[PDB]
PDB file of all heavy atoms in Angstrom:
ATOM      1  N   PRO A  70      21.336   2.659  -3.367  1.00  0.00           N
ATOM      2  CA  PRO A  70      22.102   3.793  -4.012  1.00  0.00           C
ATOM      3  C   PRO A  70      21.439   4.373  -5.211  1.00  0.00           C
ATOM      4  O   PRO A  70      20.999   3.661  -6.072  1.00  0.00           O
ATOM      5  CB  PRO A  70      23.417   3.000  -4.370  1.00  0.00           C
ATOM      6  CG  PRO A  70      23.459   1.822  -3.435  1.00  0.00           C
ATOM      7  CD  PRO A  70      22.111   1.444  -3.264  1.00  0.00           C
ATOM      8  N   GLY A  71      21.463   5.668  -5.229  1.00  0.00           N
ATOM      9  CA  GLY A  71      20.905   6.359  -6.482  1.00  0.00           C
ATOM     10  C   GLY A  71      19.496   6.404  -6.511  1.00  0.00           C
ATOM     11  O   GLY A  71      18.807   6.811  -7.504  1.00  0.00           O
ATOM     12  N   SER A  72      18.873   6.085  -5.353  1.00  0.00           N
ATOM     13  CA  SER A  72      17.419   6.043  -5.339  1.00  0.00           C
ATOM     14  C   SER A  72      16.864   7.395  -4.832  1.00  0.00           C
ATOM     15  O   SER A  72      17.656   8.341  -4.578  1.00  0.00           O
ATOM     16  CB  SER A  72      16.856   4.996  -4.307  1.00  0.00           C
ATOM     17  OG  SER A  72      17.093   5.313  -2.950  1.00  0.00           O
ATOM     18  N   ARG A  73      15.540   7.480  -4.796  1.00  0.00           N
ATOM     19  CA  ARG A  73      14.857   8.715  -4.267  1.00  0.00           C
ATOM     20  C   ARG A  73      14.055   8.442  -3.027  1.00  0.00           C
ATOM     21  O   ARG A  73      13.942   7.309  -2.612  1.00  0.00           O
ATOM     22  CB  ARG A  73      13.938   9.292  -5.359  1.00  0.00           C
ATOM     23  CG  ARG A  73      14.753   9.453  -6.772  1.00  0.00           C
ATOM     24  CD  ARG A  73      14.114  10.592  -7.553  1.00  0.00           C
ATOM     25  NE  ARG A  73      14.280  11.859  -6.759  1.00  0.00           N
ATOM     26  CZ  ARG A  73      13.775  13.037  -7.214  1.00  0.00           C
ATOM     27  NH1 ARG A  73      13.297  13.245  -8.342  1.00  0.00           N
ATOM     28  NH2 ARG A  73      13.882  14.071  -6.365  1.00  0.00           N
ATOM     29  N   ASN A  74      13.558   9.496  -2.460  1.00  0.00           N
ATOM     30  CA  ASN A  74      12.833   9.427  -1.242  1.00  0.00           C
ATOM     31  C   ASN A  74      11.647  10.334  -1.316  1.00  0.00           C
ATOM     32  O   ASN A  74      11.552  11.322  -0.516  1.00  0.00           O
ATOM     33  CB  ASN A  74      13.835   9.801  -0.018  1.00  0.00           C
ATOM     34  CG  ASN A  74      13.052   9.743   1.336  1.00  0.00           C
ATOM     35  OD1 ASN A  74      11.897   9.238   1.492  1.00  0.00           O
ATOM     36  ND2 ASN A  74      13.756  10.144   2.367  1.00  0.00           N
ATOM     37  N   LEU A  75      10.751  10.036  -2.299  1.00  0.00           N
ATOM     38  CA  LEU A  75       9.697  11.096  -2.738  1.00  0.00           C
ATOM     39  C   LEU A  75       8.709  11.298  -1.556  1.00  0.00           C
ATOM     40  O   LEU A  75       7.944  12.326  -1.472  1.00  0.00           O
ATOM     41  CB  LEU A  75       9.027  10.575  -3.925  1.00  0.00           C
ATOM     42  CG  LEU A  75       9.867  10.722  -5.171  1.00  0.00           C
ATOM     43  CD1 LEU A  75       9.219  10.366  -6.438  1.00  0.00           C
ATOM     44  CD2 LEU A  75      10.502  12.127  -5.225  1.00  0.00           C
ATOM     45  N   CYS A  76       8.558  10.294  -0.569  1.00  0.00           N
ATOM     46  CA  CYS A  76       7.556  10.483   0.545  1.00  0.00           C
ATOM     47  C   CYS A  76       8.314  11.114   1.722  1.00  0.00           C
ATOM     48  O   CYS A  76       7.683  11.341   2.777  1.00  0.00           O
ATOM     49  CB  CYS A  76       6.928   9.137   0.833  1.00  0.00           C
ATOM     50  SG  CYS A  76       5.807   8.629  -0.470  1.00  0.00           S
ATOM     51  N   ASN A  77       9.655  11.336   1.585  1.00  0.00           N
ATOM     52  CA  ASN A  77      10.487  12.042   2.579  1.00  0.00           C
ATOM     53  C   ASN A  77      10.291  11.301   3.933  1.00  0.00           C
ATOM     54  O   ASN A  77      10.156  11.913   4.958  1.00  0.00           O
ATOM     55  CB  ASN A  77      10.137  13.374   2.748  1.00  0.00           C
ATOM     56  CG  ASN A  77      11.290  14.224   3.198  1.00  0.00           C
ATOM     57  OD1 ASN A  77      12.332  14.200   2.565  1.00  0.00           O
ATOM     58  ND2 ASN A  77      11.222  15.093   4.212  1.00  0.00           N
ATOM     59  N   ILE A  78      10.523   9.947   3.963  1.00  0.00           N
ATOM     60  CA  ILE A  78      10.496   9.156   5.139  1.00  0.00           C
ATOM     61  C   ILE A  78      11.449   7.959   5.180  1.00  0.00           C
ATOM     62  O   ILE A  78      11.844   7.555   4.104  1.00  0.00           O
ATOM     63  CB  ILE A  78       9.125   8.559   5.377  1.00  0.00           C
ATOM     64  CG1 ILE A  78       8.522   7.962   4.037  1.00  0.00           C
ATOM     65  CG2 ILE A  78       8.118   9.671   5.820  1.00  0.00           C
ATOM     66  CD1 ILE A  78       7.462   6.931   4.087  1.00  0.00           C
ATOM     67  N   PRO A  79      11.789   7.634   6.350  1.00  0.00           N
ATOM     68  CA  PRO A  79      12.701   6.401   6.396  1.00  0.00           C
ATOM     69  C   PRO A  79      11.701   5.254   6.232  1.00  0.00           C
ATOM     70  O   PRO A  79      10.488   5.209   6.571  1.00  0.00           O
ATOM     71  CB  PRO A  79      13.087   6.441   7.925  1.00  0.00           C
ATOM     72  CG  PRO A  79      12.082   7.311   8.563  1.00  0.00           C
ATOM     73  CD  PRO A  79      11.749   8.344   7.741  1.00  0.00           C
ATOM     74  N   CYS A  80      12.261   4.193   5.410  1.00  0.00           N
ATOM     75  CA  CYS A  80      11.377   3.198   4.984  1.00  0.00           C
ATOM     76  C   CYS A  80      10.811   2.429   6.285  1.00  0.00           C
ATOM     77  O   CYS A  80       9.757   1.916   6.265  1.00  0.00           O
ATOM     78  CB  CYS A  80      12.092   2.107   4.167  1.00  0.00           C
ATOM     79  SG  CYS A  80      12.550   2.803   2.625  1.00  0.00           S
ATOM     80  N   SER A  81      11.619   2.373   7.400  1.00  0.00           N
ATOM     81  CA  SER A  81      11.180   1.757   8.569  1.00  0.00           C
ATOM     82  C   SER A  81       9.881   2.310   9.123  1.00  0.00           C
ATOM     83  O   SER A  81       9.089   1.620   9.716  1.00  0.00           O
ATOM     84  CB  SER A  81      12.283   1.938   9.651  1.00  0.00           C
ATOM     85  OG  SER A  81      12.522   3.292   9.906  1.00  0.00           O
ATOM     86  N   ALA A  82       9.609   3.585   8.841  1.00  0.00           N
ATOM     87  CA  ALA A  82       8.248   4.240   9.217  1.00  0.00           C
ATOM     88  C   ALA A  82       7.104   3.516   8.581  1.00  0.00           C
ATOM     89  O   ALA A  82       6.114   3.686   9.191  1.00  0.00           O
ATOM     90  CB  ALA A  82       8.292   5.700   8.979  1.00  0.00           C
ATOM     91  N   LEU A  83       7.374   2.874   7.493  1.00  0.00           N
ATOM     92  CA  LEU A  83       6.274   2.193   6.730  1.00  0.00           C
ATOM     93  C   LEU A  83       5.916   0.825   7.472  1.00  0.00           C
ATOM     94  O   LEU A  83       4.966   0.241   7.071  1.00  0.00           O
ATOM     95  CB  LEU A  83       6.732   1.911   5.277  1.00  0.00           C
ATOM     96  CG  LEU A  83       6.925   3.228   4.580  1.00  0.00           C
ATOM     97  CD1 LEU A  83       7.540   2.995   3.091  1.00  0.00           C
ATOM     98  CD2 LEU A  83       5.578   3.991   4.404  1.00  0.00           C
ATOM     99  N   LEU A  84       6.737   0.362   8.369  1.00  0.00           N
ATOM    100  CA  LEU A  84       6.561  -0.911   9.036  1.00  0.00           C
ATOM    101  C   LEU A  84       5.748  -0.761  10.305  1.00  0.00           C
ATOM    102  O   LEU A  84       5.566  -1.727  10.992  1.00  0.00           O
ATOM    103  CB  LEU A  84       7.887  -1.584   9.371  1.00  0.00           C
ATOM    104  CG  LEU A  84       8.764  -1.852   8.029  1.00  0.00           C
ATOM    105  CD1 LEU A  84       9.949  -2.703   8.560  1.00  0.00           C
ATOM    106  CD2 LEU A  84       7.984  -2.587   7.032  1.00  0.00           C
ATOM    107  N   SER A  85       5.432   0.509  10.645  1.00  0.00           N
ATOM    108  CA  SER A  85       4.672   0.768  11.940  1.00  0.00           C
ATOM    109  C   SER A  85       3.292   0.131  12.023  1.00  0.00           C
ATOM    110  O   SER A  85       2.713  -0.071  10.973  1.00  0.00           O
ATOM    111  CB  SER A  85       4.651   2.288  12.169  1.00  0.00           C
ATOM    112  OG  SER A  85       3.900   2.538  13.318  1.00  0.00           O
TER     113      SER A  85
END
Side-chain angles (χ1 to χ4, degrees):
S72 75
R73 307 210 57 179
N74 180 8
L75 289 184
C76 290
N77 211 51
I78 46 164
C80 297
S81 61
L83 297 171
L84 300 186
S85 174

